[PDB]
Amino acid sequence: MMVLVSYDVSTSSPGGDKRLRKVAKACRDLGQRVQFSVFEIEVDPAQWTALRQRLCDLIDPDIDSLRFYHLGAKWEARVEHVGAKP
Amino acid sequence: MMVLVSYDVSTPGGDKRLRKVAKACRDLGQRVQFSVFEIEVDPAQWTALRQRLCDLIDPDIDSLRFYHLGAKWEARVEHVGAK
């Protein structure tokens, strides 16, 4: 299944850089970092459960947010990219 | 239809560009994170908004990604953390 993970990391508090680094590292083997703070994760349900717990644990929920969107299969979302591909 | 719009904006003039993108989306959706918008548009409205978004960003250094979330997308989104 595809889960889209959007991480809104604080810029007005310390350590946001490190937290994003750790979130990105946790997503590295199960997905693609498609924008600075957005990850497309290709996972079965158990892999998602495991990864989700790590992501929740790695952020600071007082100042960061995660949104998780269950997309079904990537082709169903008819994804479009406009602009840069760093 | 629900289109999720994720704007990856470069960190000069970027603040202004994010503000203009948010303003263009304001009547057609919800800004659910700093640079992510849940946009509810019919196809004609999407054609119009999408063109505006393309014109408002700097495609050399910014990006947009658009996702069609489908019906009953509300049952398939989880929020964790600050709001």
Residue numbers in the entry:
A (entry chain A): 1 to 86
B (entry chain B): 1 to 11, 14 to 85
Original authors' sentences:
Cas2 is a universal Cas protein found in all types of CRISPR-Cas systems, and plays a role in new spacer acquisition during the adaptation stage of CRISPR-Cas immunity. In this study, we describe the structural and functional characterization of Xanthomonas albilineans Cas2 (XaCas2) of a subtype I-C CRISPR-Cas system and provide experimental evidence of pH-dependent conformational switching involving a hinge-bending motion during activation of the dsDNA nuclease function. Overall, the structural features of XaCas2 were similar to those of other subtype I-C Cas2 structures, including the protomer fold, the dimer interface, and the conformational state. The XaCas2 protomer contained an N-terminal ferredoxin fold consisting of a four-stranded antiparallel β-sheet (β1–4) and two α-helices (α1, α2), and a C-terminal segment including a 310-helix (η1) and a β-strand (β5) [Fig. 1(a)]. Although activity was observed under neutral and basic conditions, no dsDNA cleavage was detected at pH 6.0, consistent with the suggestion that the XaCas2 structure crystallized under acidic conditions was in a catalytically inactive conformation. Together, the functional and structural analyses indicate that XaCas2 is a metal- and pH-dependent non-specific dsDNA nuclease, and support the hypothesis that subtype I-C Cas2 proteins undergo a pH-dependent conformational change to allow metal-binding prior to catalysis.
The crystal structures of XaCas2 were determined to resolutions of 1.65 Å and 1.75 Å at 20 and 4 °C, respectively. Data collection and refinement statistics are summarized in Table I. The root mean square deviation (RMSD) of the Cα atomic positions between the two XaCas2 structures was only 0.07 Å, indicating that the two structures were essentially identical. In our crystal structure, XaCas2 seemed to adopt a catalytically inactive conformational state, as was also true of several other subtype I-C Cas2 structures evaluated previously. The crystal structure of the XaCas2 dimer exhibited structural heterogeneity in the putative hinge regions between the two protomers. As the electron densities were well defined and the B factors were relatively low, the two distinct hinge structures of XaCas2 probably represent two stable conformational states, which can be alternatively adopted via movement of the hinge region residues.
